[PDB]
Amino acid sequence: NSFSGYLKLTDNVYIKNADIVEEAKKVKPTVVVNAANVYLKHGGGVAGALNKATNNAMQVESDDYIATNGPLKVGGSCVLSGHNLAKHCLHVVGPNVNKGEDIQLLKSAYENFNQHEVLLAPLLSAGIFGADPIHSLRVCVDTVRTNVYLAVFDKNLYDKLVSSFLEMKS
Ligand SMILES: Nc1ncnc2c1ncn2[C@@H]1O[C@H](COP(=O)(O)OP(=O)(O)OC[C@H]2O[C@@H](O)[C@H](O)[C@@H]2O)[C@@H](O)[C@H]1O
């Protein structure tokens, strides 16, 4: 946990414009969050990017987990190996609002973060799943009480997130 270059938004939320995988390799974090689906299929996005960097070790361990325990709940989580990227990997499932999943569960999904004192995380539901990233950052800041280090990959999205957060801040 040697996080460098993060802007601090609140007492426990930090943000940085980085690739979450490059971040993980460099910082070797205790916990890296994966933006997961219910069957733990890491195709594309953060999940696929992380899986590739373990040369598909993650996807194999994931598939064994689903086979034993069945799908995760939307808004739920499971802790697996972090492989070469971290000690552990917390797969957290946020609502796919694009497919009509309840946006309320984004808050339950962020509540999983509070079981770890330090995390390297992306924004849940803010890509393929279609939530407003500003909304997702807002619920993260309102929900997570532990120290979360957000890697936002796209520069324009990151700029807009730090702007909007600080304009609406109180
Ligand atoms: N390499 C990356 N590094 C950092 N942030 C990233 C990266 N790739 C995407 N992001 C950002 O992380 C946030 C989450 O994007 P997704 O990974 O698409 O997350 P989510 O919306 O929860 O999508 C879940 C779905 O995506 C699939 O990969 C996954 O298997 C599941 O089906 C968004 O802001 C997105 O721009």
Side-chain angles (χ1 to χ4, degrees), residues 1-86 88-170:
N1 296 330
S2 325
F3 295 99
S4 37
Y6 288 75
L7 308 196
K8 148 170 212 153
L9 305 175
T10 65
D11 281 345
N12 59 290
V13 177
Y14 308 81
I15 191 163
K16 182 192 185 162
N17 191 21
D19 181 348
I20 199 193
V21 194
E22 286 315 317
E23 265 327 89
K25 290 156 186 236
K26 180 242 290 214
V27 180
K28 333 96 185 161
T30 316
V31 178
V32 70
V33 178
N34 170 37
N37 54 46
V38 281
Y39 292 114
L40 288 194
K41 310 156 323 205
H42 321 316
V46 164
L50 287 173
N51 181 43
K52 268 167 241 184
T54 61
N55 313 127
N56 205 94
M58 181 179 282
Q59 181 61 88
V60 188
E61 168 193 30
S62 289
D63 280 352
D64 223 302
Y65 179 97
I66 295 308
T68 309
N69 312 274
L72 299 196
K73 283 140 162 183
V74 188
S77 74
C78 71
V79 183
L80 295 179
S81 187
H83 296 294
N84 44 311
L85 310 170
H88 319 271
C89 177
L90 176 64
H91 306 261
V92 179
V93 176
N96 190 334
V97 306
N98 276 327
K99 306 193 22 164
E101 268 167 25
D102 191 348
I103 188 73
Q104 163 85 91
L105 293 163
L106 195 60
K107 198 220 212 320
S108 312
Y110 272 118
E111 295 180 327
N112 303 291
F113 289 22
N114 289 326
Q115 301 295 318
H116 310 271
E117 289 296 318
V118 184
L119 316 90
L120 175 68
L123 281 190
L124 304 171
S125 295
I128 297 135
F129 279 177
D132 175 6
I134 293 177
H135 175 65
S136 187
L137 174 55
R138 192 272 186 82
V139 177
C140 170
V141 156
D142 284 349
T143 308
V144 189
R145 295 180 305 274
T146 57
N147 298 306
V148 48
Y149 289 81
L150 300 166
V152 180
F153 183 72
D154 191 75
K155 164 149 187 75
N156 278 347
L157 179 58
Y158 162 86
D159 281 350
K160 167 173 148 265
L161 286 153
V162 187
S163 277
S164 324
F165 181 76
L166 292 184
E167 293 176 63
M168 305 165 322
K169 205 186 150 66
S170 49

